[PDB]
Amino acid sequence: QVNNKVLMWRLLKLSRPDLPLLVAAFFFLVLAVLGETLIPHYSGRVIDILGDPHAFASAIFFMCLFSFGSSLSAGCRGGCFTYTMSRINLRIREQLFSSLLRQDLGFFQETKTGELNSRLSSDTTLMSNWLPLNANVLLRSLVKVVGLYGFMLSISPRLTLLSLLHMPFTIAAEKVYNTRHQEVLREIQDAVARAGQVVREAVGGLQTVRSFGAEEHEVCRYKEALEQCRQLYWRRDLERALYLLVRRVLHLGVQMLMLSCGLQQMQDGELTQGSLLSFMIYQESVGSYVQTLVYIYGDMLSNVGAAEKVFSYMDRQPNLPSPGTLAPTTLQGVVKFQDVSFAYPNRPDRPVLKGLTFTLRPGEVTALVGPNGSGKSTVAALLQNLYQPTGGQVLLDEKPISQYEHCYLHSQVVSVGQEPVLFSGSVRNNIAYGLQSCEDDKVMAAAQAAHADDFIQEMEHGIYTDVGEKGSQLAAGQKQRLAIARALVRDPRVLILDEATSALDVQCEQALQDWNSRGDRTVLVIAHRLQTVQRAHQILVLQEGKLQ
Amino acid sequence: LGSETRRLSLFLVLVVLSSLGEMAIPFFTGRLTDWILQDSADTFTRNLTLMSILTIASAVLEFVGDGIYNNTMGHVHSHLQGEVFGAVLRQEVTEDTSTLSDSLSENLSLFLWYLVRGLCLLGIMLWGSVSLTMVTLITLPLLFLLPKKVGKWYQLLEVQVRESLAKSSQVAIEALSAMPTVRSFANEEGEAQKFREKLQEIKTLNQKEAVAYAVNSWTTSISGMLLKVGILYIGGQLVTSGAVSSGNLVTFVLYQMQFTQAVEVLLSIYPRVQKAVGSSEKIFEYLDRGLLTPLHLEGLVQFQDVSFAYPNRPDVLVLQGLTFTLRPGEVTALVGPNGSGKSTVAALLQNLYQPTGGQLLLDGKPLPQYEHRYLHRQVAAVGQEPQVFGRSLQENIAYGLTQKPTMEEITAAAVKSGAHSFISGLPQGYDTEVDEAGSQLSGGQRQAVALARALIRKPCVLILDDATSALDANSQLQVEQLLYESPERYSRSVLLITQHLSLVEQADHILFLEGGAIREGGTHQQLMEKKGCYWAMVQA
């Protein structure tokens, strides 16, 4: 199809900045091929001469020179192509990663992380072998074949006809064997995955199996899966040996037909001994290249397909709204909800909000309560310009929230997650996350605002220690107080709390809800109980998507 | 591996014969050379026939030997995997054995083939010409030292590059797995900068990797050319001297080339064999680390000085001198401290672990003396954590059954447990397959499925607990009503560890334990209208 041509053109254009390396590689390749083609001719002429010191010396010197030059070029070309491959891989990975960060949250809510890892780890390497490996081997292999056949036709115009007639019986066999192998491999892979799924299922439901004593049935099912896979293994192992036997028988026959015909032609008087030796060497060598050409051309299509699969991810269009530009100097902090209704694109036509309407004020600490199927999370999220409301509008200082700059908005308004997430960086990097620059004096001030210093300050070097992977070494309560300190380091104007008091101290919540970051800054707290009532200036319940 | 000691021996014969059959193309070739300088067709025809026959026989024997070896190795691999999984499941990794066995088998086969080939080639060369063979053996080690040294360095650089790529991959996957927070803090440029900084380190290693590759190629080519020239010179001088003819030299040259190829293959193959052999010992070490006939039970149980503990040590005992007893046809409940771990008593009722002291005989027979096959289908009940397997619903609701129940029986069991409505509402009837590990299940559906799986076997004892905790209030009320409305209170023993006092209200004799033994008990009405634990809990 034309899609393959489009992909090939895109892959050519991706390698545009590698001209100075590709030129040297394609020069050394030609030199090496031309050097390796001509050696047996000089070997045959030496043999004929032996049966005049000047000609002998000239032939020996030329053979040695060609051998050495080819040996050098065959290494220079490989080095250049390896470097080019590495450069292309490192170039494509960065583009693939930097294009994904701009996607909407629904794309990540839908796509499994395994697919992203597969694209960013495996296919970006398979598509990088197209030019340095496939298009290199195919070129030299084909050229070498053309040169060898030209020399063979020059030496004897009759003996070459037999090889020209014999070649299809090799090409067809190689094609058939490759076609069968490429599907046997994937059948084996599917069987192995299905077999592993049984062990995964047994691990998942271990308690019930031990309670009912059903091990003797899970073992039987696993044995059935193994016996299903063994047959495919045996079939592949048999096919390989059958192909090898056929290849060996065919070659011996060709050689004996070549040897007999060549001897009968020499004894007539139309050929010499060195010419027969050179022809035999050429005819022996041609077959390996003929087979490897088919192998490489068959392999190239997998790389093309992997390239298509990778490129299908970085060409997809996002669903973000139009970018904003506004950035006032002093936000008042008044937030109003007007007839807000929302439906998740992943599960559409099942609204969670039905005409929600309320108003927030700087000092009016407003608390939201009521389960509503955990719908309190949704109203918090869409106040940060993470999702767009399908109905109504949400506005900041008499302007829509979507009209403000992305970088500016998330400095005035910040929220704490319901389940805090921490990154594998240091303590200082996690507190100052997202900031261009910070000073350790502010970090101490931010940490002391959440009383997390009682744990941080016992730790060696202070704030420069490495936090465990995704906060592995921190306790549940400790992570809560670290996530809070990540907020007041930014000096927010609007603050949102997702039931932080459920794990953190209630008095700590009151201090966080009454400090300088909350004295005249709008605070919205989400509570699963009536605990927020002790300070809320405007309590608001909402159920079934409708406010109380 | 011993059980296949005969077949492998047969293989170990055939390969040897094949290794002798394929040495007829070089030898006779030299013979043909010695024929072309001394010019009948009879000897030519004889040589041709011998060469063709020997080559064909060698090919056929190799094919047969390979087939036999592969057939045996498949069975060995399958048996090993089955045993490993059985041991792992009963113990309470699998893919490691699967990914190791194929590599080990392939590398061992190649090693054996090429070792036998090399031995045969060396023997025939030594019989041919002693002096040239000695020269080749002397010059082999000196020309096979530097390429290994360069190759090790190149391999180290390659593995370093691959490890760096893997590190960057995670540096990226970790960033991409927490997108809501990154978007909330507007920190995408930071993630891009971190990824770029990670790639800037591999950019340095790639250059030296390429340089090492080029140097390795040059060294290999130079050694390959030098080796052949060194013996060609001495062979030519010997032939010119007149001690040997040209055909012997041609045969020796071909034999030397094949011998060098075999040695190089063996050197390339050996490390993988060593690594796989070393790795299999870990799997080995991980793997290596009768009852009376029951007829019927009336549901009468009792314990005297019963004790049980955790498998880690007998000092983690959660009971000490317990005296639990549930009359047949009477339903009772137990309570106690959260940290007391009384739930293990239910496990003690299921004969999962033998008592640490005393006896727990029930229905006039010892608890661990009955047959395990028939006891597990008459004393089990719904588990503490309801779940649905990946099998079909008609099979999920009857797991662990020796005989598959009929459709009418399954429907009746579901209706008695209230799961008939869930089965009817599910698409495609009972033939629908539930999601693996309860991926698409629901609390009420899971509770109904657990109740159906418990009641399908008509148990003689009930150990249902925490089933209503995961279930809804309506489902809990329905379960309680079904338990209370059973014929003559189900005419069997129930010792449910309820989580709500609503079920314990109708208890025949409630009880509460403390300090590893039952510390209080009596009628529910008496307990709730006195100084008992139930009244204190209700008032508090």
Partner: peptide, 9 residues
């Protein structure tokens, strides 16, 4: 069976 060489880059 016989050893198979990796394709040279």
């Amino acid at each position: 069976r016989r050893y198979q060489k990796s394709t040279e880059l």
